[PDB]
């Protein structure tokens with residue numbers, strides 16, 4: 001099963017999420033990203049199970065990436081669902097910051113405010129190899 005689950009917004013973080021996947025695979029990690037490894041069935045259950053299976057949870061924080069989580073108290077938003085699963089399961093969460101502004105915790109549903117307390121990594125377009133090496137140091 002995968003070592004790393006990559007959670008991202010399709011409309012803003014797709015390219016970086018894919019780039020992270022390639023690099024982490026090149027360094028010997030098994031990576032889950034939906035477009036490569038989610039297969040048939042009811043996707044809600046399968047995605048949650050895939051988060052539970054991976055030791056590491058890499059969260060691509062592109063600009064505005066938590067906006068649709070705001071006021072999503074029924075937890076229908078998919079990035080919200082994935083984050084809550086990673087937090088609940090005690091995963092090694094590794095936020096990747098690419099143009100993201102840290103929100104105040106109180107604008108987020110209580111079940112995911114803790115994601116802001118994890119040490120994040122800034123994506124550097126000018127120093128990508130060094131960014132990748134730091135991500136690998138954060139992985140368990």
Ligand SMILES: Nc1ncnc2c1ncn2[C@@H]1O[C@H](COP(=O)(O)OP(=O)(O)OC[C@H]2O[C@@H]([n+]3ccc4cc[nH]c(=O)c4c3)[C@H](O)[C@@H]2O)[C@@H](O)[C@H]1O
Pocket residue numbers: 006007008009010011033034035038043047078079082
């Ligand atoms: N029956 C359907 N079969 C196929 N596609 C469908 C279906 N119904 C809607 N869609 C279209 O699937 C796209 C994404 O949906 P969306 O809600 O926009 O996604 P987010 O970018 O908010 O959040 C992305 C993060 O959540 C996970 N994710 C979220 C949702 C899905 C749904 C299906 N399969 C996935 O693989 C998947 C992955 C992923 O692991 C990321 O980390 C849009 O084109 C939807 O029309």
